[PDB]
Structure formats: C-alpha cells, structure tokens
Design a protein around this ligand. Structure first.
Ligand SMILES: Nc1ncnc2c1ncn2[C@@H]1O[C@H](COP(=O)(O)OP(=O)(O)O)[C@@H](O)[C@H]1O
Ligand SMILES: [Mg+2]
Lengths: 58, 435
C-alpha cells in the first residue's frame, strides 16, 4: 500500500533524483573544477583546481 | 610625509567659515581670521544653500584686493562638504572656441546641480567554496557559496557560466553577483591558492568571510549632475565628451526633456535634487552678453546659488563703453546681494601670518612675527605670506631652526614687492620698452 500510496505521495524522492542528476548528455566534455581543500604540513584551507577530460581522444 | 598631488596652496589653511551654531563668527576658527560681517553673511548664504528651497539666489563678494573674497568662497566650499556640488570657475573660462558663452554658462549652471539617483539591487555576496564548469569540445555548471550563516548550491545558466568564466572565478574568492544584470565583481580572496602551483607569486591579504544571508536587497546611491545627463543624452557617444569636453551646443530640446524627466523622478521616488553652488570668481571678465544671460538664467527653477567675486570699483563693462559698479550691469546688480569685505588690522594680519606659518610648518620668532606684520601692513598680505616661505628656506639653508629677523630682512632684500619694483623700474625707465 505504501508503494501504491507513493504513486501520490512520492513527490520528494523521485523529483529530487530526476532534477539533481549527476550526469549530462553524451559526448566530449571538459570539466573545470575548483574546491576548497584543507592545508597540510575555520581551519587553514587552500584552493585547488582539477581539470577532467571525458575521453582520451580529447 | 609623502608628496601628494595636493600641496600647500594659497588657501590650504582654510577649513571652513569658523562659525558657531548661531552663525556668529569666531575671531580665529577653521583657519578664518577677522571678516566677521562677511563670514556671518557667508554663513547665512550657506544655510540658504543647504535648505535648497530657493533657486537662483545670487551673492556678490565685493571688496578690496587681498581682503579674503576667495578665502571666504573656499571656506564656504569646505563647510559645504563633497555631497553638495560646488563648481568654481574663473570668469575667463567661459570664453571658448568649442561653444558659445551662453552654452558655457549653461553647462556651468547645470554642473552645479546634482541629481541623487537611488535604485534597489539584488546582490549575492559569499565565499566560493566550489565551482564546477563542464563544456563540450552548451555549458553546464554548479556553484556553491558560503556566508557563515548558510551554504547554498546553485545551478548555473549559460550566461552566468560565461560571466563566471570571464571573471575567472575560483574557489576561495569572495565575490558579488548583481542578479539584475549578472555583473560579477570580486571583493577579494579568503585564503591562498594551492602552494603547489608555481608562479602565482602573491600573498595578498585575505578579506573576512561575509555574514548574514547570501542574497540581500541593497539600496545604492548614485549622484550625477545635470550636465552629465545632458552630455550622455546629447549623442550616442556622449559619455566620452564628459572627459574630453568636446561638447557642442547641446540642443535645448534635450535639456527640456531632461528637466521634465528629472521633475518626474522627483515627483516619483527615483531621484532627489541636490542644488549646489556656482562660484564665478573675477566675474568682471564676463561681458554684457554673459551678464544678460545670467539675468534670465537665475530665474530658472533649476538654477543653483551663484556666488561672485570682483575687486573692480566703478569700471567699464567688458564689450561696452558704460561704467557700472563692480563691472556688473545694474540689471544684474539688482538681482544680487552684495557682501563687502573690510581691510584687516595688525592683529588680524598677525593671526593670518601665524596660521600660514603653521600650515607651512615654519617656526618663527615673535620679533620676526612683528617685523613681518609691519611688512605685510606696509606692502601686502600676500607678499608677507610669500616671505614666510622664502625666509623658511633661507633659515634652513643656514641650518637654523627658527626664522629670525635676519632671514626676513634677507628675503625682503632678495624679493621685491610691486612698489619697490615699480620705483626701480621708474629709476631705469629708459631701459624698459616703450617707456
Ligand atoms: N580671513 C582670512 N583668514 C585666513 N586667511 C585669509 C583671510 N583673508 C585672506 N586670507 C589669505 O590671504 C590671501 C589673500 O588672497 P584672497 O583671499 O584670494 O584675497 P582676494 O580674493 O580678496 O583677492 C590668501 O592666501 C587667503 O587665503
Ligand atoms: Mg581672490
């Protein structure tokens, strides 16, 4: 019944998973990424950049 | 210490009018000495300016040369502050090859009227904690901002992604995003870039983390003069003419359109009029056409308070053969109030010399003060003022600490005033040209 009821009440999980997808359309993509990372020998932090390529050809 | 653009000028000691709450001038306050009646009148005129309810009030400061007319004008300017516009021109500045005298007087009047615009803006302000941009080789992206109070993850549109890429936004940047137009401004960094990156040779100070909500409704105040509005609206590339001064005679229809929309902006809540002061020093250089324009120009509701100065007595009006008081026609003199300045006494001259020595940082003995006061009374106040500097230099040359009488006598003998130079010119008149 909960699964049946979720046909009406599953407003949250399904919408969140459909909207906040972690992937995009096919093809070559170049991802610029920059995150805070903690410094090593609020806390001491520094900024670091990663560049990610979808395929070896690009 | 360091030599700034602004140095010690002829009125650097003037800080204001030196008045109390009742506009009763002090003997020596804010760099002003004497001129009690003239300074009280200047205070009343300054109150009239600050009230802003009356348009086109003209005041003429008339007095003998060196009696403090420009000093009083500069005191009014200092006590007015930067909020209220105060345009000071020489009367000879209106004679232009780029525009007519009447156009120049209009631009001078319209420069002395501020328009204080207000607008509300949506501003995002926070620390970039993560930024991801993915592009083919449309662009997609995700940006997270923090502000101590909250941390929100944003899904970025293409235009915002383009702006962020152009600004080169990186994690650890304290940025500001104007939601109205997408303009991105960086306030500063919050912590260093990775030490492992070569080059990047900087250790700039890190601004403190923003606080409160990420998005705030911020009210911003922008002030422009009527002349800036006119020049901007005069042509497609008008804004460039605000700096180069290549402004031809702006069409009167554009000025009427601006006056009307400014009136609407002040009937609405969009803008507030800040009427200021136009100071025409040495107004006797204006010709009859300029005075005749000033007559009608002061009758406009957008006219500022016009302050004028001249030392001419009953003299010939330029461009005519008629003589009138102050070199101004009686028709304009009727439209103005005259404030008269009186010659100084020994005490006032000594106090002025003391203030000038203090501003020039010259230590000088009391006997030197007495001899310099006698010289200033005999010759002129400005001559004694310039002897202050010359005697300081002569004293420092001899490795002295306090300017004594010997230095004043030395510089008096070195540098002549108008009278002794004139006597020597007459003694050698045959050597000079055309007798
Ligand atoms: N009441 C005063 N207080 C302080 N300084 C004054 C006063 N009157 C004149 N001075 C100074 O003496 C000089 C006189 O020049 P100025 O004031 O331009 O006279 P004017 O404009 O009447 O020719 C200036 O350096 C001025 O700053
Ligand atoms: Mg003067």
């Amino acid at each position: 019944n909960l699964r049946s009821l979720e046909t009406y009440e599953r407003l949250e999980a399904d919408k969140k998973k459909q909207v906040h997808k972690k992937r995009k359309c096919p093809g070559p993509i170049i991802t610029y990424h920059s995150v805070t990372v903690p410094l090593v020998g609020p806390p001491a932090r520094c900024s670091r950049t990663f560049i990610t390529f979808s395929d070896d050809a690009t | 210490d360091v030599t700034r653009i602004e140095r010690i000028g002829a009125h650097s000691h003037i800080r204001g009018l030196g008045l109390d709450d009742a506009l009763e001038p002090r003997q020596a306050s804010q760099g002003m000495v004497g001129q009690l009646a003239a300074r009280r009148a200047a205070g009343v005129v300054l109150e009239m300016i600050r009230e802003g309810k009356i348009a086109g009030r003209a005041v003429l400061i008339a007095g003998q040369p060196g009696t403090g007319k420009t000093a009083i004008a500069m005191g009014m300017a200092q006590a007015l502050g930067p909020d209220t516009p105060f345009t000071a021109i020489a009367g000879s500045e209106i004679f232009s090859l780029e525009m007519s005298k009447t156009e120049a007087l209009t631009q001078a009047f319209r420069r002395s009227i501020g328009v204080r615009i207000k607008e509300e803006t949506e501003i995002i302000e926070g620390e970039v904690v993560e930024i991801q941009i993915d592009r083919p080789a449309s662009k997609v992206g995700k940006l997270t901002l923090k502000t101590t109070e909250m941390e929100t993850i944003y899904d970025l549109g293409t235009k915002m992604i383009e702006s962020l890429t152009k600004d080169k936004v990186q994690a650890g940047d304290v940025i500001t995003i104007d939601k109205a137009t997408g303009k991105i401004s960086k306030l500063g960094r919050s912590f260093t870039r990775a030490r492992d990156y070569d080059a990047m040779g900087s250790q700039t100070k890190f601004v403190q983390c923003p606080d409160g909500e990420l998005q705030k409704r911020k009210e911003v105040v922008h002030t422009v003069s009527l002349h800036e509005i006119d020049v901007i609206n005069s042509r497609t590339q008008g804004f460039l003419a605000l700096f180069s001064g290549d402004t031809g005679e702006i069409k009167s229809e554009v000025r009427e359109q601006i006056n009307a929309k400014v009136a609407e902006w002040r009937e609405e809540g969009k803008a507030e009029i800040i009427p200021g002061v136009l100071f025409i020093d040495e107004v006797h250089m204006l010709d009859i056409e300029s005075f005749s324009f000033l007559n009608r120009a002061l009758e406009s509701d957008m006219a500022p308070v016009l302050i004028m100065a001249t030392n001419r007595g009953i003299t010939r009006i330029r461009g005519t053969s008629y003589q009138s008081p102050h070199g101004i026609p009686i028709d304009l003199l009727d439209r103005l109030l005259i404030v008269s300045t009186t010659p100084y006494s020994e005490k006032d001259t000594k106090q002025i010399l003391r203030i000038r020595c203090e501003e020039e940082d010259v230590e000088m003995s009391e006997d030197a003060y007495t001899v310099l006061t006698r010289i200033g009374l005999e010759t002129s106040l400005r001559y004694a003022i310039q002897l202050i500097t010359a005697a300081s230099l002569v004293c420092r040359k001899r490795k002295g600490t306090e300017v004594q009488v010997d230095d004043i006598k030395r510089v008096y003998s070195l540098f002549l005033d108008e009278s002794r130079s004139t006597q020597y010119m007459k003694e050698y008149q045959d050597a000079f040209l055309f007798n």
